[PDB]
Amino acid sequence: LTQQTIISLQREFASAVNLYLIPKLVLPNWPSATRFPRLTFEMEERNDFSAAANLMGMLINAVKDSEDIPTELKALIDALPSKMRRALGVVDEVREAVRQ
Amino acid sequence: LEGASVPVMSTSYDVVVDREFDELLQGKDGLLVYHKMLSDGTVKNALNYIFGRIRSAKWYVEPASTDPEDIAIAAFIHAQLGIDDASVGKYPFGRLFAIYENAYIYGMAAGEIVLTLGADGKLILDKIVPIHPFNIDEVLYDEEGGPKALKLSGEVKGGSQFVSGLEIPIWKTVVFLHNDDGSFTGQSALRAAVPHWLAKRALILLINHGLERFMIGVPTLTIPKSVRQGTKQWEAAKEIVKNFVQKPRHGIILPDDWKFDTVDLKSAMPDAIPYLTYHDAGIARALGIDFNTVQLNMGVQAINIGEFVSLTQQTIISLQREFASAVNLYLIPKLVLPNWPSATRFPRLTFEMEERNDFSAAANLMGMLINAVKDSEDIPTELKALIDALPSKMRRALGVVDEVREAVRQPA
Amino acid sequence: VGKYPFGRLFAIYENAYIYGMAAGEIVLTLGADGKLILDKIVPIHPFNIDEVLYDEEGGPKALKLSGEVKGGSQFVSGLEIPIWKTVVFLHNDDGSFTGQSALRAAVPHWLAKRALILLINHGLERFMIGVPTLTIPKSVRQGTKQWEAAKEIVKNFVQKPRHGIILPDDWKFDTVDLKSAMPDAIPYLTYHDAGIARALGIDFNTVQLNMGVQAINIGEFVSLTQQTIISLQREFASAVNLYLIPKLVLPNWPSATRFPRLTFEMEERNDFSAAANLMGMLINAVKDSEDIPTELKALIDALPSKMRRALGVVDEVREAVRQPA
Amino acid sequence: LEGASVPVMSTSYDVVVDREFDELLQGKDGLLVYHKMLSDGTVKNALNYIFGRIRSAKWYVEPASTDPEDIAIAAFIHAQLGIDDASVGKYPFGRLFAIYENAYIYGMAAGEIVLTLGADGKLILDKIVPIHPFNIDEVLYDEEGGPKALKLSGEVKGGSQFVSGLEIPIWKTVVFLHNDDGSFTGQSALRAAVPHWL
């Protein structure tokens, strides 16, 4: 119940960074830029980790005999309905790009 | 084919004027009461929970149909709001919720919709200018009782100038009403909490006063009839009574015809805490919260707190629908029509229903679906086909298969 | 959520629940497809209904309205609308076409609660502060310095307790002996207060909520309350099915003899774990099918009633709408 | 393509002036009350929990789209902040949270954004200079009630000189407001706790 208060404060903080800071860092380097990256966070409302970890195991088992498990697994996850996708966590394409 | 034969009429009869019978809560004097209630810790605790839960409802855009054009228009709106997993969004998204919060507290609020030319050649949302009910003189109506404009008066932020009877047409605005009864009159959610709030404040004053007389005692000094005011003896009497209260360690030396005592109150102090917390917790009950916000986790209670949080969801889901209705009626058509002048049906802002925790059972079913299509040549396609064929309860438990999100996530 | 007018119908039904009856004017316009479509519902508040007019057989034929146009442009006096231009919501119609407020049976508990809060407020002051008494010699007369001193003592006892009381030896100060502790009226107050919600057919305590020693199974009392709320859902659906849907169908299909019906999913018990498990067993059975959706829908419609209904609605109308042209 | 016809207006009516009715909590005298409340053990216990949970929220950067260019720009920002599993980050990341904490306590705070030339040729974040509400005289507004600058007065740390009415344009700053009602006026989160504290 207390998380509904604290998540509101996280949104207030993110809004200020997204409005005042990020455009000031992007425009100098990309003067034509029309849309901007956004700072955001993972929603923590309830502890569904046991059920979510079990589903993660069932997804891996399904793509196990794949010639490229990472690619097939990421494809299968993005196809899940919203509640099921979000329970596994963030598939961070920006982290992936930085780690190249 | 004929239009309406019945006009919109005021909710007025006898002492009830535009839904209100109590003179102290009529018009802008009413707004000052609701403003003062925001300084109460129990009111603020309730609004923090309610407003937090509303924003967390997993907001998304449903298209008018599965037609590719309806999907395209829905994707434009998705992009305008910055729909995302945390409902952070682009700047104006958050501003709409802040205006709706003023409507919840005061009964009505609004924003001016400002468009600009996008890089694509499309007209896009530039900003929402918030309008506070303190700065609304009145709503103006046509001859059939339909709203046509807002009349505004107030000081420009910074104190450069006063605004005096400025009129803005309704078609340039989004208007949020709380609990509209059909007359286009909003009402503060705090209305039914006023009696409990007044009672709580009066009881805290009474307990504070009682605690001093039972904690310290009321000193009495009985002296001979010969002692008159303005004597050395008289000063000594006043000094004894004063020191009893201020300097208890001092002690009291008396001649044998002077008698000191405290008033016998003839019982223990009454325990008013249960009656105080009845009125205090009653503030949150009046907003439709179905768990005790003052005792919270303390004391002997029901085993299943989760069920009382689920009961509270029926109140908060109603507020989510009220917010969505206003966006769908006032904002989305104003963003679509400039770019698609022939448009006859519109995307709708909506949310995921959160009533019960069925996640363990739903995740287990999700696993059984994946296992069934596992040896498919294209698992995503087959899985989405199988899900849309499920009976309603089973489909909805898995979550939203968001075709608009899918269209946006198309790489160019 | 729906389109704008959907929500407006629920707001009108809410007025019917509170007051006994309410109504809305149905306004149609020409759609892009050439069809007559719903334009809007104009809500009608019972404060603005003079009466229902009846034919010679006691069937309703019109509403007579009086009220002020919103914004105060003019007063409307005895305006008559035929019933066929309206949706009418009655709460608990007994067969006579007379609605009754759901709040009727709560009035006594509401009056008792208000009277008890006044009585407790008054009692709490006399037990918390005390009623001061001052006994003085017969010689002390009104309109004297001594008389003012007496009035100042009793006033200050109430207002300024830290002040203290100095008395000559033939003056006696006391508080009235009430001869017992204050009676605990909280249980009787909460009996009447919680009684307001009992009178509306709610079967859990809405005043104590989660607090105090209780039944283990709160869920069963929420299920009992569903029998009240499902009845209200049927009352709402009946009015839409009778007054609104035929008015949307007949203009476009003048020969129409049968009509679609607004309905809802029955929510009585939480059988979701068992139902989700069965759904998994059905899928596993048709898994090696060349067309799983078709075979699965065939198998589900063949299930016995309890088992079919537990899975939810197989909505053929939703399926038709979701057809891309 | 029409401009706004309605200006931003103050939340003021009768005794309510810019959201506040109690004289003892108006303006900078108000800030002294909220500062004193920080020495209360129950206030500090609550702020420790709230501020800790905010920083622990697994912060990351979402791109404007799945387009490779939008991903590239998002990666630049990710690198500027030093996004990582513990939300430790590079020096300035932590400074933004410290400034937001002042906004929560007092109602508003700010930071000056300073850029420098990076090794790659790009303009990069050099630092955020924190601005405390004790050292803000006022926000300056345009004719439509939009904020344009901050006017500052205070003593330079170390006591070298007093600064008097220094003006910084808003485009050189990040501004944090707590619970902005639409008027660009923040409010202390501690406001509703004052009666219980007394």
| The 3-state secondary structure of chain A, one letter per residue | CCHHHHHHHHHHHHHHHHHHHHHHHHCCCCCCCCCCCEEECCCCCCCCHHHHHHHHHHHHHHCCCCCCHHHHHHHHHHCCCHHHHHHHCCCCHHHHHHCC
Find out whether C267 and C257 touch, Cβ atoms under 8 Å: no
Angle between helices D91-106 and A3-16 (to 10 degrees): 120
What are the b/e assignments for B127-162, b being 16+ CB within 10 Å?
bbbbbbbbbbbebebeeebbbebbebebbbbbeeee
Task: Give the number of other Cβ atoms within 10 Å of residue A53's Cβ.
Answer: 12
Find out whether C16 and C89 touch, Cβ atoms under 8 Å: yes
Chain C interface disruption, residue of B139, B215, B218, B265, most C CBs within 10 A: B218
Beta-carbon separation of B325 and C219 below 8 A: no
Sign of CA dihedral D90, D109, D58, D43: positive
Chain A interface disruption, residue of B398, B402, B403, B405, most A CBs within 10 A: B398
- Expressed in percent and rounded to 5, the helix, strand and coil fractions of chain C are 45, 20, 35
Find out whether A77 and A85 touch, Cβ atoms under 8 Å: yes
* Determination technique for this entry: X-ray
Backbone angles phi, psi at C209, to 5 degrees: 50, -120
Chain B nearest C-alpha distance from C151 (Å): 16
- The residues pairing with C69 across neighbouring beta strands, listed in sequence order, are B9
Question: Tell me, what amino acid is at B216?
Answer: I
Using the Cβ of C317 and the Cβ atoms of chain B, whether some distance falls under 8 Å is answered with: no
Resolution in A: 2.0
Question: First vs last Cα of chain D: how many Å apart?
Answer: 53
The full DSSP string for C213-252 is S--S-HHHHHHHHHHHHHHHHHHHHHHIIIIIHHHHHTTT
Q: What is the 3-state secondary structure (H, E, C) of chain B?
A: CCCCCCCCECCCECCEECCECCHHHCHHHHHHHHHHHCCCHHHHHHHHHHHHHHHCCCCEEECCCCCHHHHHHHHHHHHHHCCCCCCCCCHHHHHHHHHHHHHHHHCEEEEEEEEEECCCCCEEEEEEEEECHHHEEEEEECCCCCEEEEEEEEEECCCCCEEEEEEEEHHHEEEEECCCCCCCCCCCCCHHHHHHHHHHHHHHHHHHHHHHHHHHCCEEEEECCCCCCCCHHHHHHHHHHHHHHHCHHHCCCCCCCCEEEECCCCCCCCCCHHHHHHHHHHHHHCCCCCCCCCCCCCCCECCCHHHHHHHHHHHHHHHHHHHHHHHHHHHHHHHHCCCCCCCCCCCEEECCCCCCCCHHHHHHHHHHHHHHCCCCCCHHHHHHHHHHCCCHHHHHHHCCCCHHHHHHCCCC
Dist CA B140 CA C70 (whole Å): 9
Rg (CA), chain B: 32
Which residue of chain C has the CA closest to B267? C181
Q: Quick one: which of B298, B321, B300, B297 has its CA closest to B309? A: B297
Beta-carbon separation of C128 and B369 below 8 A: no
Using the Cβ of B296 and the Cβ atoms of chain D, whether some distance falls under 8 Å is answered with: no
Dist CA C279 CA C311 (whole Å): 7
Q: Which secondary structure element, helix H or strand E, spans residue D97, and what is its range?
A: helix D91-106
Q: Which of residues 14-73 of A touch D (CB under 8 A)?
A: 16-17, 20-22, 24-26, 28-30, 33, 35-42, 44
Using CB atoms, pick whichever of B43, B111, B155 lies closest to residue D9: B155
Chain A nearest C-alpha distance from B384 (Å): 7
Task: Give the number of other Cβ atoms within 10 Å of residue D61's Cβ.
Answer: 24
User: Token match 């008013």: residue?
Assistant: B272
Between β-strands B219-223 and C165-168, what pairing exists: parallel, antiparallel or unpaired? parallel
Task: Give the number of other Cβ atoms within 10 Å of residue C195's Cβ.
Answer: 17
* Chains C and A touch, using 3 or more CB pairs below 8 Å: no
Count interface pairs B-D at CB distance under 8 A. Answer: 119
Which chain B residues contact residue A76 at CB under 8 A? 370, 379-380, 383
Find out whether D98 and D79 touch, Cβ atoms under 8 Å: no
Q: Nearest 5 degrees, angle CA B124-CA B126-CA B132?
A: 130
Q: Two tokens at B398? A: 């898995």
Angle between helices C272-285 and B359-372 (to 10 degrees): 0
Could you tell me where the beta strands, DSSP code E, fall in chain C? 21-30, 36-44, 49-54, 60-68, 75-82, 86-90, 132-135, 165-168, 172-175
Sign of CA dihedral D92, D97, D100, D102: negative
Which residue of chain B has the CA closest to A80? B401
Q: What is the DSSP letter of C201?
A: T
Count interface pairs B-C at CB distance under 8 A. Answer: 310
Task: Please list, in sequence order, all residues whose beta carbon lies within 8 angstroms of the beta carbon of residue B67, skipping any fewer than 6 positions away.
Answer: C324, C325
Find out whether D31 and D108 touch, Cβ atoms under 8 Å: no
Q: Quick one: which of D101, D113, B118 has its CA closest to A21? A: D113
Which chain A residues contact residue D177 at CB under 8 A? 12, 16
- The residues pairing with D2 across neighbouring beta strands, listed in sequence order, are none
Dist CA B158 CA D185 (whole Å): 11
Find out whether C101 and C18 touch, Cβ atoms under 8 Å: yes
Rg (CA), chain D: 19
Dist CA D143 CA D4 (whole Å): 12
Task: Please list, in sequence order, all residues whose beta carbon lies within 8 angstroms of the beta carbon of residue B347, skipping any fewer than 6 positions away.
Answer: B61, B62, B63, B64, B70, B73, B74, B77, B332, B336, B404
- The residues pairing with D166 across neighbouring beta strands, listed in sequence order, are D152
Dist CA B293 CA C236 (whole Å): 34
Task: Give the number of other Cβ atoms within 10 Å of residue D26's Cβ.
Answer: 13
Using CB atoms, pick whichever of A4, A41, A54 lies closest to residue B52: A4
What are the b/e assignments for A64-94, b being 16+ CB within 10 Å?
eeeeeeeebbeebbebbbbbbbbbeeeebbb
Dist CA B67 CA B81 (whole Å): 22
- The residues pairing with C25 across neighbouring beta strands, listed in sequence order, are C42, C86
Dist CA C210 CA C220 (whole Å): 15
Dist CA B385 CA B397 (whole Å): 16
Find out whether A90 and B398 touch, Cβ atoms under 8 Å: no
Q: Nearest 5 degrees, angle CA D188-CA D189-CA D190?
A: 85
Sign of CA dihedral B317, B321, B322, B324: positive
Beta-carbon separation of B82 and A38 below 8 A: yes
Which residue of chain B has the CA closest to C68? B9
Q: Quick one: which of B353, B362, B357, B367 has its CA closest to B395? A: B362
Task: Please list, in sequence order, all residues whose beta carbon lies within 8 angstroms of the beta carbon of residue C157, skipping any fewer than 6 positions away.
Answer: B218, B263, C130, C132, C165, C173
Dist CA D196 CA B376 (whole Å): 63
Chain D nearest C-alpha distance from A31 (Å): 12
Which chain D residues contact residue B408 at CB under 8 A? 65
Burial class, B411, CB count within 10 angstroms (exposed 0-12 / middle 13-18 / buried 19+): exposed
Burial class, B403, CB count within 10 angstroms (exposed 0-12 / middle 13-18 / buried 19+): middle
Q: Two tokens at C135? A: 């006994």
Sign of CA dihedral A15, A21, A22, A28: positive
Which chain A residues contact residue B58 at CB under 8 A? 82, 86
Task: Give the number of other Cβ atoms within 10 Å of residue B383's Cβ.
Answer: 22
